[PDB]
From a paper:
Importantly, 3′-8-oxoG impairs the ligation step of BER and therefore must be removed by the exo activity of a surrogate enzyme to prevent double stranded breaks and cell death. [name] has been shown to be the major 3′-exonuclease activity responsible for the repair of 3′-8-oxoG lesions in human cells. [name] end processing of 8-oxoG, during which the oxidative DNA lesion is removed, results in a ‘clean’ 1-nt gapped substrate suitable for DNA synthesis by Pol β during BER.
To see how the [name] active site accommodates 3′-8-oxoG, we crystallized [name] bound with nicked, double stranded DNA substrates containing 8-oxoG at the 3′-end and a phosphate at the 5′-end of the SSB. These substrates represent potentially unligatable, BER intermediates in which the repair polymerase, Pol β, has misinserted an 8-oxodGTP across from either a templating A or C. To obtain crystals of the substrate complexes, we employed a double-mutant catalytically dead variant of [name] (E96Q/D210N). Specifically, DNA bending at the site of the nick results in an open intra-helical cavity in the DNA, and in both cases the 8-oxoG base is in an anti-conformation and positioned out of the protein active site into the open intra-helical cavity where it does not form any base-pairing interactions with the opposing A or C. This conformation allows the damage-containing 3′ end of the DNA nick and phosphate backbone to shift into the protein active site for cleavage. Of note, density for the 8-oxoG base is relatively weak, for the structure with 8-oxoG opposite C. We attempted, but were unable to obtain, crystals of [name] with an analogous uncleavable (i.e. phosphothioate containing) substrate. Therefore, it is likely that the relatively weak density for the 8-oxoG base is the result of high mobility, as opposed to low occupancy. Supporting this, the B-factors for the 3′-8-oxoG, as well as the 5′-base and opposing base, are higher in the case of 8-oxoG opposite C. This high mobility in the DNA region around and including the 3′-8-oxoG base likely results from the lack of WC base paring between the 3′-8-oxoG base and the opposing base and the open active site pocket in which the 8-oxoG nucleobase resides.
Residue numbers in the entry: 43 to 318
Amino acid sequence: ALYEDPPDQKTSPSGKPATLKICSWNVDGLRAWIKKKGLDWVKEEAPDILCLQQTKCSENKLPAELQELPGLSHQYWSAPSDKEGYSGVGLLSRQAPLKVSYGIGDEEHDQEGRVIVAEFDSFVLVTAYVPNAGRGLVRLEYRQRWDEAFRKFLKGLASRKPLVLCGNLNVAHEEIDLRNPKGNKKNAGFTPQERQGFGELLQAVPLADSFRHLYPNTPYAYTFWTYMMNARSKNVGWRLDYFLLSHSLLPALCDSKIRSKALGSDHCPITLYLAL
DNA sequence: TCGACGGATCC
DNA sequence: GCTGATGCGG
DNA sequence: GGATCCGTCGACCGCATCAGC
């Protein structure tokens, strides 16, 4: 079935107006995504913070258009140490952060340009491109090690400041989170190991799944569709892109959106409204 | 994500 | 710059 | 022995690389 995202709720559970708009987008090729009008859609949407994953573009080759975004003037990028065209993430912000960090503090997990950490006044933002378990599950063993290291890192962070985590987490948590759960239990992104990892991450940090907390029983809400088989036009998709929040931020939560109609990638953008 | 292959089983 | 092959993705 | 039924498999889309000029 096809999905319409409900209207943006911009007031908190206590009616505070939203003060912060964060958009996350796994662009799957920054240069292509710009040619496909992605920055235009970003301008229409006008977020305070914009997080990009799977940029596949080293720092040298960053397009010029990115320096024409004055609402996102503070810009940070991470590319793999020695794998061109692969992975990559960016964080662009209206206001400068207090401090920015790359990686999670673990050598084996910090070589593929997957994590940027931006500390602001009242919270810390992490944007992440989690490793795919791979076709045939070649990297499932690796992914389990990452999941544990990432969880351990996020727990540390959330013990010092309220934490917002966004990006492609490369798992559909539950059967409601993808169109074809039955035929995907052995495929990357819906293995029990990946689902267990996600569950443990929600419990251990702890974090709440912003979208599922507001729409706990809403089916067919996905952030990714394979380019093949006309899957997007059939809404045969997976929810892979999340905003996970520290529980303290839940009364700051105004809404968590799926921007289903924005084209430019095999992921659509997600948007988070907080009253901070 | 399909649809095509089997091999398997049941009426 | 252009072809043709390969890596990677969920 | 004709149909139906499940695991298993291999190709499609798209972006960016690399090898070779």
